[PDB]
Amino acid sequence: TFFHPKSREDILNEEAKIVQALNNQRELTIKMHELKREEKDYAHSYSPLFSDPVPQGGSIGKAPGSSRE
Amino acid sequence: TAAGISLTGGRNRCFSEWQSFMHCTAKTDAKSRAQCLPNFEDYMECLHHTKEKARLREIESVLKQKKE
């Protein structure tokens, strides 16, 4: 009579909830390992404001014919 | 920060090819970055002048042994 255990069903549901959360952490971990080591944008990596990488040089003797694409 | 500037305060000698290469880097992502090879090779040729030097070595060889 003093034996008052939790039922089989509630036990199985609790273990299932635990395993579900562990699988959620697994997917989050993989997804972040993938989000890192993914190529970013230049603005996120170097310069948000001057996002044009292209280097403009000096101006004291700017020769027409020195720009190129 | 002081890149692409000459001794007179202007654009250097090899700036233009560097500009084309930097343009094509901005156009491409790391997977498509292979397209920037000939631009980079042109930059290195302007800098170090190797392929033109070897061209002239071939010309000089023809002036050197095939005549004497």
General description of the model:
This is part of a larger assembly, with chains A (69 residues) and B (68 residues). Chain A contains two helices and no strands. Chain A is mainly alpha-helical. Chain A has one domain (1-69). Chain B is an all-alpha fold. Chain B has one domain. Chain B contains three helices and no strands. Classes of the chains: A mainly alpha (69), B mainly alpha (68). The interface between A and B is medium-sized, with 18 and 22 residues. It is classed as membrane protein. Keywords: NADH:Ubiquinone Oxidoreductase, complex I, membrane protein. A 3.7-angstrom structure of Yarrowia lipolytica complex I with an R121M mutation in NUCM.
Task: Give a brief rundown of this model.
The structure is cut from a larger assembly and holds chains A (69 residues) and B (68 residues). Chain A has 69 residues and is mostly helical. Chain A contains two helices and no strands.
Shape of chain B: flat
Helix content class of chain B: 55-70%
Run of helices and strands of chain A: HH
Domain count of chain A: 1
Structural class of chain B: mainly alpha
Radius of gyration of chain B: 17 Å
Assembly category: part of a larger assembly
Helix content of chain A: 40-55%
- Rg of chain A, Cα atoms, Å: 30 Å
Number of domains of chain B: 1
The biggest beta sheet of chain B reads: none
Ends distance of chain A:
88 Å
Dominant shape of chain A: rod-shaped
Strand composition percent of chain A: under 5%
Organism (chain B): Yarrowia lipolytica
Family (chain B): Belongs to the complex I NDUFS5 subunit family.
Subunit structure (chain B): Mammalian complex I is composed of 45 different subunits. This is a component of the iron-sulfur (IP) fragment of the enzyme.
Main location (chain B): mitochondrion
